Amino acid sequence: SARIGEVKRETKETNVSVKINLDGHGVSDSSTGIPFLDHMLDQLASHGLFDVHVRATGDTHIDDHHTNEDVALAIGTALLKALGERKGINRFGDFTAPLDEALIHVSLDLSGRPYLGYNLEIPTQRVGTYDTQLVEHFFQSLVNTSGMTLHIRQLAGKNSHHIIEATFKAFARALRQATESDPRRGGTIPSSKGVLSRS
Template sequence: MTRSATIDRQTRETRITGQLELDGSGEVRVATRIGFLDHMLGALAFHAGWDLTLECRGDLEVDDHHTAEDCALALGEAIDRTLGERAGIRRFGSAHAPLDEALARAVVDLSGRPWPEIHLGLSREALGGLACESLTHVLISLAMAARCALHVDVLRGANDHHRAEAAFKATALALREALASVGGGVPSTKGSLGGTP
C-alpha cells in the first residue's frame, strides 16, 4: 500500500499543488519562489525519504509569510491524510543533525495532538528572502497540520544558515523514524490517536 497524498490548497493568498509519497526515494521538486524555503523544504523531504513535488504561487508582493505558512500547512495536512487512523507506524522519533558547527535536536510524537515547541535561536532578520521568524513558523505550522508533538531545539551554532538547516534535517530524520511502517495496530494504549487527550 502506498502512503501518498495529493496536495491542492487554494486560498486568496496562496495556490499550492503537489504530491507527497511518504515511502519515496528523496525525489524532490519544491518551487515556492522563495529560495531559502525551497532549500529547507527540499532538505526536509529528502532526508525524510519522501518523494515530494510542491509548487506555490503566493502573494509575495505582501511578504513571505503566507507562502511559508501555507506550504507548511499543505505539507502537514498531506502527512496527516496519508496516515489515516495512524495504525502501524512507529509513532515516536528523535534525531540529532549537525551541520558543521551547528547541532540540532528534533523529537516527534505523531500523537494526533498538535504541540509545536520550536526553538531555533536565530539572530539574523532573514535568510535569503525568508524572514527567520517564518522559519520558526513553518515548523509550528507543519506540526499543527500534521497533528504531532514536535520539539526542535538548536543546541549550538554560530551561523544561522547552518542552524536552520540542521534544524530541518533533524526534523526530517525524526519524522522518518516516527513515520516508519512497523505493522500492527494503532500504537496507543488508548487504542486511538484521534487527538483527544
C-alpha cells in the same frame, strides 16, 4: 501500498499544491516561490526519503509570510492524509543532526495532538531573501494540520543557514523514523487508548 497524501489549498493570498509519499525514495520537487524554503524541503526529501512535490504561488510582494504559512499548512494536511489511522508505525521520532557548528535536536510524536516546542535563536533576520522568523511559523503551521507533537531544540549554532538547515535535516530524520513501519508491532495502532486522531 505507498502512503501518499495530496492537497490543493487556495485563498485570496496563495495557491498551493502538495503531494507527499511517506514511503518514497527521496524525490525532490519543491517550488514554493521562496528559494530558501525550497532548499530546506530538498533536505526533507534527501534525508527523510519522502517524495516531496510542492507548488506554490502567492503574495510575496507583501512578504513571504502567507506563502510560507500556507505551504506548511498544506504539507501538514498531506502528512495527515497519508498517515491515515497510523496503524503499525513507530509513531515517535528522535534525532539530533549537525551542520558544522550548528546542532539541532528534533523529537516528535505522531499523536494527533498539535504542539510545537521551539527555542531556536537565529542571529540574523534574513538568509538570502528569507525572513528567519518564518522558520518557527513553518513548523507551527505544519504541526497544526498534521496532528504532530514536535520539539525543536538548538544545542549549538551561529550561522543562520546552518541552524535552519540542521533543523530540517534533524526533522527529516525524526519524521522518517516516526512514519516508518514498526517491525515488531504487527500492524497494531501504537497507542494504549486504541486510536490516534487529530480530533
